[PDB]
Design goal:
It is a single chain. This protein has 127 residues and is an all-alpha fold. The chain is built from 5 helices and no strands. The protein has one domain: Bromodomain-like (Histone Acetyltransferase, Chain A, Up-down Bundle), CATH 1.20.920. Helix 3 packs antiparallel against helix 4 and helix 4 packs antiparallel against helix 5. Bound molecules: the ligand COc1cc(OC)c2c(=O)[nH]c(-c3cc(C)c(OCCO)c(C)c3)nc2c1. The ligand COc1cc(OC)c2c(=O)[nH]c(-c3cc(C)c(OCCO)c(C)c3)nc2c1 binds next to helix 4. Belongs to the BET family. It comes from Homo sapiens. It is found in: Nucleus; Chromosome. This is Bromodomain-containing protein 4.
């Protein structure tokens, strides 16, 4: 069994910025989700070998996780807040696509996503 390479977190020729919206995404959005009791399954790429999910990366072709997002934010990988918001949404959607309603992992994602939505509802206007 084999995992894919993780998503890119470094690319020196990708344009990047540090916007006030991106600072909010790190200091408020990521920090809130990361500390949550249900964060742990989402803090690193899905290890499809250790979890014995051999079809995971057959179904999930755009993997994302908060470990990857955390590194992207800390390394100022992004140009804009929409890029980062898309990553969070890709993470949640992958969970819903792969799993079944009412599974524990789906309940965990839902809890995290509720908080994500409440925080992004107050994303600041760009300075
Ligand atoms: C431990 O961290 C994770 C993270 C996950 O996603 C972010 C998942 C995830 O998306 N599905 C599952 C999961 C677990 C079991 C036992 C399942 O039945 C095995 C097939 O008979 C299925 C279909 C999914 N485990 C995760 C664990």
């Amino acid at each position: 069994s084999m995992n894919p390479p993780p998503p890119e977190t470094s690319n020196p020729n990708k344009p990047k910025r540090q916007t006030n919206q991106l600072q909010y995404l790190l200091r408020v959005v990521l920090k809130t989700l990361w500390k949550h009791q249900f964060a742990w399954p989402f803090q690193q790429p899905v290890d499809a070998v250790k979890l014995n999910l051999p079809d995971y990366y057959k179904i999930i072709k755009t993997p994302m996780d908060m470990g990857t997002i955390k590194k992207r934010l800390e390394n100022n990988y992004y140009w804009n807040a929409q890029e980062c918001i898309q990553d969070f949404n890709t993470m949640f959607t992958n969970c819903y696509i792969y799993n079944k309603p009412g599974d524990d992992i789906v309940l965990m994602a839902e809890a995290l996503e509720k908080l994500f939505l409440q925080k992004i509802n107050e994303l600041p206007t760009e300075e």
